[PDB]
From Swiss-Prot, chain B:
It comes from Mycobacterium tuberculosis (strain CDC 1551 / Oshkosh). Keywords: Hydrolase. This is Glucosyl-3-phosphoglycerate phosphatase. Substrate binds at R9, R59, H158. CDD domains: HP_PGM_like.
Length: 208, 212
């Protein structure tokens, strides 16, 4: 059984939608990266891959420091692009297109104009999980079986990728509530293609 | 307009759960199980729940009592929150079971409509427990109400029941119920039911699964 842990980065200064804007962790967010590093470092991560956005990457570096591991980076793990909503607050978006923000969360195929849907986000990240399965023999290996791959990413991607791996029907993707700052989720891949791997949800949105 | 529902699994029992089937056998918490109940109440009791309802199996009830003490609430009990009945498998080791019916134990986990002889499937457990949630919606007007919309209802229960009830509330297709994994000792799960006025139209989401 292969364990996959996903960590949502800590708090940024930004209420205000980011998507793929490369915003910075706040002071609090850095403090949260250190705390999460401690928590997850005890699970003895096998390997760390991070979105290249700084709020994720700076979080992942703190986990790398704690575990003495070298952080890997992949652009397919970026936050959902939020099109015309990037840079706008909820109050602005809600005044501009009333009720759309709330309806959006209930439909995984729907995107803000110019943005990606949750389905898009699962489509571009999932091959990364498949690639790690192929290339990391130790992962779920006989020697150290429960050492998890840790992905340092963003809330939207965690939910999209998790529902995709669990093979939830798209209409049920909203069953997964939003990840909090510096919170983590764990999936387990049980047995021989990648597709035949049965993923189960071990932990959703645990505070780190 | 969101109702918070927290489900707590009891702590460790003096019983080898990993190799031997418990079900509705009324096993006691171990000493560690008791310490875990105190610790879990310190976390969950920090904010005052609206209400505590417990399985009447003593490993859950004793856990719920620690929470009631911490919060100054009574503990109500309900047989509908009992652990999944495992029928002829109750008290049997995995080895006994795996020799009698090779492959059955692993196949069971992957089929929410399958039950050991004499027992209950995930679907059966959802059938007895989901209506209890509907009753609480009807009987707790403060729940998700205007005054303190965040105070949760707390069910003190069992792992299999948490997964069955949670999948039923989330309205996952039965085929997808095994996507919900295990719950640890003294771990909790939280759902939020978001707003018609009928129970079926409440849309539940998973806020937290298996936090310790």
């Amino acid at each position: 059984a292969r364990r996959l842990v996903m960590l949502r980065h800590g708090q940024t200064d930004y209420s205000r939608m980011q998507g793929q804007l490369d915003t910075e962790l706040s002071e609090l967010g850095r403090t949260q990266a250190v705390a999460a590093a401690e928590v997850l470092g005890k699970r003895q991560p096998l390997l760390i891959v991070s979105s290249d956005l700084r709020r994720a990457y700076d979080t992942a570096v703190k986990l790398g420091e704690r575990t003495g591991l070298v952080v890997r980076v992949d652009t397919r793990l970026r936050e959902t692009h939020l099109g015309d909503w990037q840079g706008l607050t909820h109050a602005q978006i809600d005044a501009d297109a009333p009720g759309a923000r709330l309806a959006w969360r209930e439909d995984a195929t729907w995107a803000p104009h110019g943005g990606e849907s949750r389905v898009d986000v699962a489509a571009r990240s999932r091959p990364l999980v498949a690639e790690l399965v192929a290339s990391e023999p130790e992962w779920g290996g006989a020697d150290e079986p429960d050492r998890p791959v840790v992905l340092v990413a963003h809330g939207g991607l965690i939910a999209a990728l998790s529902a995709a791996l669990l093979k939830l029907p798209v209409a049920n993707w909203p069953a997964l509530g939003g990840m909090g700052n510096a919170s983590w989720t764990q999936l387990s891949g049980h047995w021989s293609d990648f597709e035949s791997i049965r993923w189960r949800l071990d932990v959703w949105n645990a505070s780190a």
